[PDB]
Design a protein around this ligand. Structure first.
Ligand code: SF4
Length: 753
C-alpha cells in the first residue's frame, strides 16, 4: 500500500489501513448491518474477524492494538511484571512518559531540577528498562502522556492502549484509545491477543456551533451531568452530527478525555477536516493524506445504530462548572455563585489552576491569555493564586514564543513544569492547613476528595481554562464573566469580552528542547538494576496458585459504604513514591474507604484482638495469622484511575475476593488479572444481609464456569446461615488466570515450564 510511518520516531512501522479495510469487510459481510465508527475501528483490529463472536455488551473480543503508551506512575509495575515474564523485547511500538512524579512547589525549571534529583532511581530504572526491552522514553519535562500522544502518535483509526484512564484523549484524532492496567499492557507488549468486552455504543449528536464563552469542555461537563459517573460504563461514546466541524481537534480531545469520568470504555470523533489540519500542522500531512484515501472507513456508516442517543445543541450550550466532590454535579457558571451560597461551599477561590492534558492546548492557552490581557489592560491581576501547566514542551516553547506565557505571568500566574503536578496531588500546597475548608477551581477533570492536595475539605470545581482565568481575576464564584462587572485601577467598571484566539499557531509549532530517547535497537545489553534494599523499587515474587478448594470462613476486612474510588483504595499524592514497591505501597490499602460499622475512614475492628485500627495493619495481621479475607462494597466499586495497585495490594495482603453491587471496568479487569475474585450480588439487596461480623463461604470454585453463579453461605454468629448467589463475568481465559494465581503466572506456564 502506502508505506506511511506511524510516527517520526518509528520510520519502519507502517500504518495498516489495508488491514483495517480487509477486517471491516470480513466483519460487515457477517453482520450485514451498518457499523458505527467505533465498531469499524475496534472490529477492524480483531485477531480473528472471521470467527470472533460479536455481540455488544456480551462477548469478549480478542484484539490486536497498534501501540502501547505508559506514564511513569504505572510504567514501573508494568515493567516489573514484563521483567518477570522473561520476554526479551516488546512486540509493538511502546513509550514511557515521565509526567507523574514532578511536584509543584517553586514553578517550572526549579521543580523539574528537583524532581530529577529526588526521583533519580526511578527515572534511571525506566530509562534502562526502556533501552533494554525496546521501549521509547520521553524524559521528565517532555510533557503529559496524552498531549505527547496527540502531538506525535495518535492518528485516525489507531487502536492504542495506555496505562492511564485518560488515554481516551486520543479519540480527538479519530482513534480508539483505551485505558488499561499495567498487566493488560504486558499482554500486548508480549504479543498475545488483548481481550475487551464488546462495547455498547452511546451516540451524542452535536448540533449548531459553539459561541462566545462556551468552549469544548462544556460539552463534556454537560454530558457528565446527564449521564452521571456511572452512565457510560461498558460503552464507547461516539460523537457525530453537523456540530462536530465547529470543534477544533484539541477541543475534541478535551471532550473525549473527560468521558473517563462517566466510566465509558473510550470516546471517539469521526475523521474530518479539523483533524486533517491538526495532522498537517504537527508534521503529519502524509498521514492526513493517507487517511483521506481511507476516509470511508474513518467515519460511521450511514444509518448505524446507537444503543442510546443524546443530542446537544452547541448553540444553546452555556458555560458550566462542575463539582464540588464529583465531576457529574453540573452547574452553569451563572448559578454556581448562588448554589454555593445555599450549600455552604466557600465562595472565595484560593487557587485557580489551568492546564493538565484535558486543557493545555495552544488554543486553551490562547483563550486564557485573551481573558488575562483584558484584566491587565485595566490594571488588574489575579485575586486568587493562579498556576499554569503546559501539556508538553512543544506547547511551552510555542506559547512562550507567541507571547501567551508572558501575559499569564503578568496577571500573577506561576508556570509549572510540563507534568501532572496538582492534577494527581503532586503539589506542595501550604496556604491552607489540612482540614481547612476552602475552594479551588481547575480546568482539570477529576475533583474527588483529597485528590489535588490531600485535604478532604478542599472543594474543587472543574471548568474550562478561560473561565478559571476569569474567576481567578475575580477571586469569587459569585462572578459570572458573561454578565458581571469588574472595576479597573482607574475606577471604571468594565466587562470581560468573550475570548477569541487562534486554534493552532500561525507559524509552525516550536518543538522546544530534545526530550525523546530512542532505544538502541542494536546494542540492548543493559542490565536493569533494582537494589534489594530499595525503598522505591522491588522485584515481584509470584502469587500462589489456587489450592483447588472452596473459600471457607472468610473474614470481612471491611464492608464499605457508598463511593469507593481507586484513590480510596490506593491513594496517590505521597504514595506515588512507592509505585514500584508493592510491600511499601500496600500500607495505604483502603485507608480512604468509609467503614459502614462506624462510618470512619481507616478504622476497622480486628476480629481477634477487638481493637479498632488501621485497615493495612489489620490485613497484615490476618495474613500473618492465616485468616483469608474479603471486601464487601457498594455500587461502582473501583471508580476512577486505572492503577492496578488497587488490585495488587489486596492480593498481597491476603485478600481473596471483593463482592460488590457493581464494578468499574478497569478495576474489575485488574482484580481478575491478579488472581482475585470480583463478584457481584445477584440481588443487590443482599448487601444488607451481610454484617461486618459474618463469615462467608464461597462455594463452587471446582466447577467455576462462564455464566454460572457462585453460591455464598453467609454464616451469622448466632449460628444462622443464609445462602445467596453471586455473579461474575469471567470467560474461560480469565478462569485460567484465577486457577494459576494470576494472569502473569498463567503466561509463564505457557512458556513450556
Ligand atoms: S493526572 Fe491529570 S494531567 Fe496527569 S495524565 Fe491524568 S488527567 Fe492528565
Amino acid at each position: 500500500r502506502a508505506k506511511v510511518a506511524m510516527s517520526h520516531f518509528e520510520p519502519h512501522e507502517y500504518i495498516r489501513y489495508d488491514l483495517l479495510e480487509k477486517n471491516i469487510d470480513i466483519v460487515r459481510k457477517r453482520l450485514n448491518r451498518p457499523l458505527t465508527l467505533s465498531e469499524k475501528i475496534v472490529y477492524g483490529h480483531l485477531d480473528d474477524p472471521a470467527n470472533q463472536e460479536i455481540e455488544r455488551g456480551k462477548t469478549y473480543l480478542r484484539l490486536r492494538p497498534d501501540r502501547v503508551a505508559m506514564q511513569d506512575a504505572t510504567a514501573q509495575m508494568a515493567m516489573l511484571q514484563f521483567i518477570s515474564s522473561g520476554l526479551p523485547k516488546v512486540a509493538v511500538p511502546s513509550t514511557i512518559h515521565c509526567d507523574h512524579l514532578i511536584e509543584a512547589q517553586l514553578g517550572g525549571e526549579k521543580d523539574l531540577r528537583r524532581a530529577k534529583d529526588i526521583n533519580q532511581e526511578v527515572y534511571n530504572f525506566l530509562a534502562t528498562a526502556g533501552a533494554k526491552y525496546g521501549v521509547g522514553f520521553w524524559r521528565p519535562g517532555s510533557g503529559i502522556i496524552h498531549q505527547i500522544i496527540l502531538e506525535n502518535y495518535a492518528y485516525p483509526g489507531v487502536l492504542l492502549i495506555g496505562t492511564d484512564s485518560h488515554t481516551p484523549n486520543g479519540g480527538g484524532l479519530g482513534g480508539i484509545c483505551i485505558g488499561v492496567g499495567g498487566a493488560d499492557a504486558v499482554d500486548v507488549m508480549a504479543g498475545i491477543p488483548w481481550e475487551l468486552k464488546c462495547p455498547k455504543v452511546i451516540g451524542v449528536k452535536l448540533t449548531g456551533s459553539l459561541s462566545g464563552w462556551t468552549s469544548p469542555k462544556d460539552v463534556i461537563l454537560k454530558v457528565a451531568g446527564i449521564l452521571t459517573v456511572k452512565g457510560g460504563t461498558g460503552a464507547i461514546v461516539e460523537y457525530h452530527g453537523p456540530g462536530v466541524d465547529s470543534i477544533s481537534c484539541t477541543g475534541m480531545a478535551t471532550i473525549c478525555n473527560m468521558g473517563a469520568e462517566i466510566g465509558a470504555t473510550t470516546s471517539v470523533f469521526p475523521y474530518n477536516h479539523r483533524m486533517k489540519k491538526y495532522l498537517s500542522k504537527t508534521g503529519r500531512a502524509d498521514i492526513a493524506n493517507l487517511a483521506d484515501e481511507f476516509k470511508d472507513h474513518l467515519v460511521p456508516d450511514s444509518g448505524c445504530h446507537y444503543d442510546q442517543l443524546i443530542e446537544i445543541n452547541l448553540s444553546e450550550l452555556k458555560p458550566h462548572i462542575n463539582g464540588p466532590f464529583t465531576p457529574d454535579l453540573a452547574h452553569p457558571v451563572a448559578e454556581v455563585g448562588s448554589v454555593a451560597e445555599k450549600e455552604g461551599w466557600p465562595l472565595d477561590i484560593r487557587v485557580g489552576l489551568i492546564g493538565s492534558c484535558t486543557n493545555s492546548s495552544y488554543e486553551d492557552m490562547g483563550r486564557s491569555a485573551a481573558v488575562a490581557k483584558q484584566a491587565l489592560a485595566h490594571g488588574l491581576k489575579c485575586k486568587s493564586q493562579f498556576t499554569i501547566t503546559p501539556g508538553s514542551e512543544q506547547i511551552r516553547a510555542t506559547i512562550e514564543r507567541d507571547g501567551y506565557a508572558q501575559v499569564l505571568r503578568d496577571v500573577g500566574g506561576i508556570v509549572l513544569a510540563n507534568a501532572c503536578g496538582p492534577c494527581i496531588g503532586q503539589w506542595d500546597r501550604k496556604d491552607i492547613k489540612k482540614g481547612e475548608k476552602n475552594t479551588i477551581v481547575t480546568s482539570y477533570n477529576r475533583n474527588f476528595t483529597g485528590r489535588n492536595d490531600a485535604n478532604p475539605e478542599t472543594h474543587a470545581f472543574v471548568t474550562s481554562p478561560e473561565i478559571v482565568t476569569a474567576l481567578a481575576i475575580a477571586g469569587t464564584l459569585k462572578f459570572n464573566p458573561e454578565t458581571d462587572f469588574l472595576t479597573g485601577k482607574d475606577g471604571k467598571k468594565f466587562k470581560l469580552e468573550a475570548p477569541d484566539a487562534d486554534e493552532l499557531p500561525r507559524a509552525e509549532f516550536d518543538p522546544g528542547q530534545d526530550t525523546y530517547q530512542h532505544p538502541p535497537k542494536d546494542s540492548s545489553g543493559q542490565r536493569v538494576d533494582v537494589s534489594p534494599t530499595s525503598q522505591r523499587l522491588q522485584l515481584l515474587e509470584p502469587f500462589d496458585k489456587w489450592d483447588g478448594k472452596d473459600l471457607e470462613d472468610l473474614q470481612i476486612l471491611i464492608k464499605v459504604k457508598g463511593k469507593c474510588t481507586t484513590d480510596h483504595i490506593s491513594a496517590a499524592g505521597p504514595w506515588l513514591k512507592f509505585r514500584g514497591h508493592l510491600d511499601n505501597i500496600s500500607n495505604n490499602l483502603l485507608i480512604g474507604a468509609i467503614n459502614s460499622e462506624n462510618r470512619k475512614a481507616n478504622s476497622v475492628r480486628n476480629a481477634v484482638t477487638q481493637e479498632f485500627g488501621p485497615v493495612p495493619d489489620t490485613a497484615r495481621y490476618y495474613k500473618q495469622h492465616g485468616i483469608r479475607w474479603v471486601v464487601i462494597g457498594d455500587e461502582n466499586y473501583g471508580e476512577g484511575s486505572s492503577r492496578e495497585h488497587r488490585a495488587l495490594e489486596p492480593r498481597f495482603l491476603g485478600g481473596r475476593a471483593i463482592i460488590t453491587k457493581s464494578f468499574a471496568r478497569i478495576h474489575e479487569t485488574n482484580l481478575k488479572k491478579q488472581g482475585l475474585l470480583p463478584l457481584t450480588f445477584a440481588d443487590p439487596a443482599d448487601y444488607n444481609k451481610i454484617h461486618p461480623v459474618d463469615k462467608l463461604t464461597i462455594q463452587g470454585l471446582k466447577d467455576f464456569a462462564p455464566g454460572k453463579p457462585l453460591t455464598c453461605i453467609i454464616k451469622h454468629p448466632n449460628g444462622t446461615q443464609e445462602t445467596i448467589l453471586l455473579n461474575h463475568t469471567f470467560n474461560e481465559t480469565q478462569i485460567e488466570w484465577f486457577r494459576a494465581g494470576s494472569a502473569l503466572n498463567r503466561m509463564k506456564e505457557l512458556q513450556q515450564k
